[PDB]
């Protein structure tokens, strides 16, 4: 009744350590040689490592050689396996071989018994983004990302992912406006963010503030974002077309109260010069670009004298809780995206509006739109966080 | 004067003791010089006399160092007997009964043909020898061989009768070039080491002058037997002659390649020697009367 | 291994000496051997030395005169003398070892390695010794020797014993003619000098007498 068993398996993320214990069960291993074997889907067996009888003489393959070190007991009779320096080519299933003959060491189909076999996964990142913003660029800047480091990079844009994320938690990095992430780090789903001293210099105070939950921060901030007119264009609202379901377009007109026709119609009307003003973010400013039409932007009309107040957005992105991947997500977002190459990148599809980054703020201050765009969300006041906005947005629908 | 019958087997039996006596550094040797006939990772896992036989001993087990050892006893009792038997009854008859004294080209000519006899019959167990001794579990061509008689049966049923016999010319290229060196450095450095009288003339300089002799004779005959143990240790197919495998170990690696394990080599020629002249003497001497 | 020599004898000088040295049984062909010679009063010094293969080795002071050869077939070694003096006269002895033991040239001076020694020989080369009277010139006689002795290289003495009359019944007698074959050289009585027959000098006292002294 020869048994062997392996454990250890398991997901681990990259530039990690793990332990795989082989067990022998109804042999005698004093004359027995241990070996490893891994294999790929679609692929056959490889030689991993080896061991002699009495630990003296050990042998490893040419691409782990310095990386994984083998190890056995007699008294305890099993076989150990250290893992370092993990790579993602090391996704596999293992599997504990003992070779009868003894003192051996050769390619498979020489030994005489066989294990079960562990899984061990490299998972990569993977990165949902909202299918309005430009994703291509952030998928160029996950691939110079995989060029530098040797981590793969994926972008995905589910539809309705603010209802998505809270029921699949799931993604590691979730990019979103800073309304919903109060109410995720209340329920728990989000991690703790703890930038250095420095890197919190960069970006301006009130922005780091906006994303901030009883004196911590759960989520770096990347753009500010708020409504403008897209066009003598009227001055006051006492023709125009705008997506009415989302109550995000319409709130504007109706803010003394306070809180605390389809989108993609709207946009092929005025892509063809039907209409003539239409009130929407920087994000579709690309499209414009795309329609051959001249376009200008203007601060919203006022209403019985009183100015518009638009809801103004810090569009930043959060770090999953469960994520095995903590540490290669904030390396990617502290050193890559918060850039001015990975930034400039991303703003070449479709612009963001005013980038907290002070280095390419001052650059892109320059523009006359984005100064129009600040210019009207001053006339407005910064969306709340409080958990409360998940019914709310909701009851403002209906 | 011993019979031909008892020179021939107190030969052989010294010989074969010899051979006993010091395989791992032929072992040594023979994996020293097979080292980097294939693309490999450039690290180098042998490098060392010791270094070789520890790691050999260490990692595939102490019974590696002597594999292929009957093949070795059976080339020991059918070539060596012959030739060291042989070539004193050919020497003798070249003198024509001590008519004159023997010259160096006398001598000559009896190696050389004592050894081209020896070369041509008995080379199976050398080509067997080879590819035992070359063979590892762990790196390269994957271990075809379970032994020294099935050996014998696969080449015979697998290759034939004729393929046991690949690469004798570098054999007989080999006996010439170490024979000829051997006799002509042995006898120049003892004559101008007498006739200068650095050191007097008894056996230790007639010792040292044969030490000389034997080391220039490895180190001359070391590239021809280089390019003999990557030929014979060679898949059928992938080799077209020996001087496409001369020719691709120069493009390859260069020629200091040409000169790989050149001190187990020579250790192996001088320890052989002494053992089996010592035994053979000791023997014949006892069994004469 | 009793080893034996032979060629003793006294001689005159300038003469070629032939010693042989043999061992008993035919142990001679696996052996190598050496002569070595002791001065009256005086400890054993090196003089020549064949190994077995056949290459001889000569002393410093021995160079160029002596000749060494070894007979297998007669099993013995053969030493020649050229140019002999009174300066060689010694006791010789031949030595033999067993092969292998030497290692350097010089290694063959050590008596150390030799092991088998023989009898022996005595040598001798008696020089010509001339008794003068009393009553003549000895010093000019003892000058005439010394002249002798640098010129050529043998020892030359003047006595003076007392009654020759009856005491000489040396090599060269000095006396007046009443006694007396001789060379006159001075005129009283006539005083001549003789040539004793038992002198083995006889061809250098000839050359002594008629080179230098008479002049
Ligand atoms: N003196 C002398 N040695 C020889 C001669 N031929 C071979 N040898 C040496 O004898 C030893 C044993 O030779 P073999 O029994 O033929 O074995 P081998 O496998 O050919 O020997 P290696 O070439 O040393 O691996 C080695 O040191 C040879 O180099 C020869 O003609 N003369
Ligand atoms: O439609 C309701 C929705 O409005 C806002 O979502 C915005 C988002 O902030 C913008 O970045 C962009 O994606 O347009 C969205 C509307 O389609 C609120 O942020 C959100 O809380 C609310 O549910």
Redesign the pocket.
Same mark, same amino acid.
């Given at each position: 009744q020869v048994q062997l068993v392996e454990s250890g398996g398991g997901l681990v993320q990259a530039g990690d350590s793990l332990r795989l214990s082989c067990a022998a069960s109804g042999l005698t291993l004093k004359n027995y040689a241990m070996g490893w074997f891994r294999q790929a889907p679609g692929k056959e067996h490889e030689f991993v490592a080896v061991i002699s009888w009495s630990g003296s003489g050990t042998s490893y393959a040419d691409s782990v050689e310095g990386r994984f070190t083998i190890s056995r007991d007699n008294a305890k009779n099993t076989a150990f396996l250290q893992m370092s320096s993990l790579k993602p080519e090391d996704t596999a299933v293992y599997y504990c071989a003992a070779r009868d003959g003894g003192y051996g060491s050769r390619w498979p189909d020489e030994y005489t018994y066989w294990g079960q076999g562990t899984q061990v996964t490299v998972p990569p990142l993977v990165i949902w983004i909202?299918g $309005?913003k430009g994703y291509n660029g952030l998928a160029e800047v996950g691939k110079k990302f995989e060029k530098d480091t040797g981590i793969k990079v994926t972008v995905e844009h589910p539809d309705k992912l =603010?209802e998505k994320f809270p029921q699949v938690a799931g993604p590691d990095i979730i990019f979103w406006?800073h $309304?919903?992430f109060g109410g995720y780090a209340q329920s728990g789903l989000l991690a703790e963010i703890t930038p250095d001293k420095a890197f919190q210099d960069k970006l301006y105070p009130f922005t780091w503030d906006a994303v901030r939950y009883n004196g911590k921060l759960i989520a770096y901030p990347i753009a500010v =974002?708020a409504l403008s007119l897209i066009y003598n264009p009227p001055k006051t609202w006492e023709a125009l077309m705008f997506n009415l379901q =989302?109550?995000?377009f319409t709130w504007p007109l109706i803010a003394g109260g306070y809180a605390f026709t389809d989108y993609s119609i709207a946009e092929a009307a005025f892509n063809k010069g039907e209409t003539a003003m239409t009130i929407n973010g920087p994000w579709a400013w690309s499209n414009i670009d795309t329609s051959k039409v001249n376009y200008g932007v203007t601060v919203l009309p006022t209403f019985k004298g009183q100015p518009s107040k638009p809801f103004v957005?810090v569009?930043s992105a959060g770090i999953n809780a469960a994520s095995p991947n903590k540490e290669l997500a904030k390396e990617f977002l502290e050193n890559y995206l918060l850039t001015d190459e990975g930034l400039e990148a991303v703003n070449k599809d479709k612009p963001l509006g005013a980038v907290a980054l002070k280095s390419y703020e001052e650059e892109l201050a320059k523009d006359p739109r984005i100064a129009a765009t600040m210019e009207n969300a001053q006339k407005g006041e910064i969306m709340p966080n409080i958990p409360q906005?998940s019914a709310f947005?909701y009851a403002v629908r209906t | 004067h011993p019979t031909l019958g008892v020179q021939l087997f107190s030969a052989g039996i010294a010989a074969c003791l010899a051979d006993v006596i010091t395989f791992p550094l032929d072992t040594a040797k023979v994996r020293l010089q097979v080292q980097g006939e294939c693309p490999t990772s450039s690290v180098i896992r042998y490098k060392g006399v010791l270094g070789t036989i520890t790691a050999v001993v260490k990692t595939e087990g102490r019974m590696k160092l002597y594999s292929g050892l009957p093949a070795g006893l059976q080339r020991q009792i059918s070539s060596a007997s012959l030739r060291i038997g042989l070539y004193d009854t050919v020497q003798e008859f070249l003198t024509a009964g001590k008519e004159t004294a023997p010259s160096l080209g006398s001598k000559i000519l009896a190696g050389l043909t004592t050894g081209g006899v020896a070369v041509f019959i008995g080379q199976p167990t050398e080509v067997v020898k080879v590819r035992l001794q070359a063979q590892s579990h762990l790196h390269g061509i994957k271990p075809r061989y379970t032994g020294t008689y099935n050996a014998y049966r696969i080449i015979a049923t697998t290759e034939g009768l004729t393929g046991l016999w690949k690469g004798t010319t570098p054999n007989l290229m080999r006996s010439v070039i170490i024979n000829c060196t051997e006799l002509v450095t042995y006898d120049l450095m003892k004559e101008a080491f007498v006739k200068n009288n650095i050191l007097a003339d008894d056996v230790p300089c007639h010792l040292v002058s044969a030490l000389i002799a034997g080391f220039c004779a490895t180190a001359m005959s070391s590239p021809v037997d280089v390019v003999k143990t990557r030929f014979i240790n060679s898949p059928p197919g992938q080799y077209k002659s020996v001087p496409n495998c001369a020719m691709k170990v120069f493009t390859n690696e260069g020629p200091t390649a040409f000169f790989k394990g050149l001190v187990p080599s020579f250790l192996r020629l001088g320890s052989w020697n002494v053992i089996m002249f010592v035994c053979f003497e000791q023997l014949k001497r006892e069994l004469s009367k």
């Amino acid at each position: 009744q020869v048994q062997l068993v392996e454990s250890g398996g398991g997901l681990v993320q990259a530039g990690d350590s793990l332990r795989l214990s082989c067990a022998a069960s109804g042999l005698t291993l004093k004359n027995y040689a241990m070996g490893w074997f891994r294999q790929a889907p679609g692929k056959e067996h490889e030689f991993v490592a080896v061991i002699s009888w009495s630990g003296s003489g050990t042998s490893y393959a040419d691409s782990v050689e310095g990386r994984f070190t083998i190890s056995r007991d007699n008294a305890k009779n099993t076989a150990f396996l250290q893992m370092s320096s993990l790579k993602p080519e090391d996704t596999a299933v293992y599997y504990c071989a003992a070779r009868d003959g003894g003192y051996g060491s050769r390619w498979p189909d020489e030994y005489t018994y066989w294990g079960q076999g562990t899984q061990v996964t490299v998972p990569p990142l993977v990165i949902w983004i909202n299918g $309005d913003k430009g994703y291509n660029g952030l998928a160029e800047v996950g691939k110079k990302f995989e060029k530098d480091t040797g981590i793969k990079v994926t972008v995905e844009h589910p539809d309705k992912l =603010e209802e998505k994320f809270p029921q699949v938690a799931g993604p590691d990095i979730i990019f979103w406006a800073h $309304d919903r992430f109060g109410g995720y780090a209340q329920s728990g789903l989000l991690a703790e963010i703890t930038p250095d001293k420095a890197f919190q210099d960069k970006l301006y105070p009130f922005t780091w503030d906006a994303v901030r939950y009883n004196g911590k921060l759960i989520a770096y901030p990347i753009a500010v =974002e708020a409504l403008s007119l897209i066009y003598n264009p009227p001055k006051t609202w006492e023709a125009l077309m705008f997506n009415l379901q =989302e109550p995000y377009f319409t709130w504007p007109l109706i803010a003394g109260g306070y809180a605390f026709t389809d989108y993609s119609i709207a946009e092929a009307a005025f892509n063809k010069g039907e209409t003539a003003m239409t009130i929407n973010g920087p994000w579709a400013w690309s499209n414009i670009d795309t329609s051959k039409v001249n376009y200008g932007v203007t601060v919203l009309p006022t209403f019985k004298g009183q100015p518009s107040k638009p809801f103004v957005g810090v569009l930043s992105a959060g770090i999953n809780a469960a994520s095995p991947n903590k540490e290669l997500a904030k390396e990617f977002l502290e050193n890559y995206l918060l850039t001015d190459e990975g930034l400039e990148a991303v703003n070449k599809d479709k612009p963001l509006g005013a980038v907290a980054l002070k280095s390419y703020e001052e650059e892109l201050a320059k523009d006359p739109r984005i100064a129009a765009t600040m210019e009207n969300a001053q006339k407005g006041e910064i969306m709340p966080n409080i958990p409360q906005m998940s019914a709310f947005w909701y009851a403002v629908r209906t | 004067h011993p019979t031909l019958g008892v020179q021939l087997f107190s030969a052989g039996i010294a010989a074969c003791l010899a051979d006993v006596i010091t395989f791992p550094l032929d072992t040594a040797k023979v994996r020293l010089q097979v080292q980097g006939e294939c693309p490999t990772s450039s690290v180098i896992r042998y490098k060392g006399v010791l270094g070789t036989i520890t790691a050999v001993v260490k990692t595939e087990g102490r019974m590696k160092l002597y594999s292929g050892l009957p093949a070795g006893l059976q080339r020991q009792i059918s070539s060596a007997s012959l030739r060291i038997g042989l070539y004193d009854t050919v020497q003798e008859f070249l003198t024509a009964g001590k008519e004159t004294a023997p010259s160096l080209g006398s001598k000559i000519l009896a190696g050389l043909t004592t050894g081209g006899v020896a070369v041509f019959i008995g080379q199976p167990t050398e080509v067997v020898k080879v590819r035992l001794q070359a063979q590892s579990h762990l790196h390269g061509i994957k271990p075809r061989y379970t032994g020294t008689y099935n050996a014998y049966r696969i080449i015979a049923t697998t290759e034939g009768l004729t393929g046991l016999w690949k690469g004798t010319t570098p054999n007989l290229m080999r006996s010439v070039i170490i024979n000829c060196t051997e006799l002509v450095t042995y006898d120049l450095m003892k004559e101008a080491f007498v006739k200068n009288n650095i050191l007097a003339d008894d056996v230790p300089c007639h010792l040292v002058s044969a030490l000389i002799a034997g080391f220039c004779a490895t180190a001359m005959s070391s590239p021809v037997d280089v390019v003999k143990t990557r030929f014979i240790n060679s898949p059928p197919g992938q080799y077209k002659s020996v001087p496409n495998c001369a020719m691709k170990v120069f493009t390859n690696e260069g020629p200091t390649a040409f000169f790989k394990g050149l001190v187990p080599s020579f250790l192996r020629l001088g320890s052989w020697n002494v053992i089996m002249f010592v035994c053979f003497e000791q023997l014949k001497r006892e069994l004469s009367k």
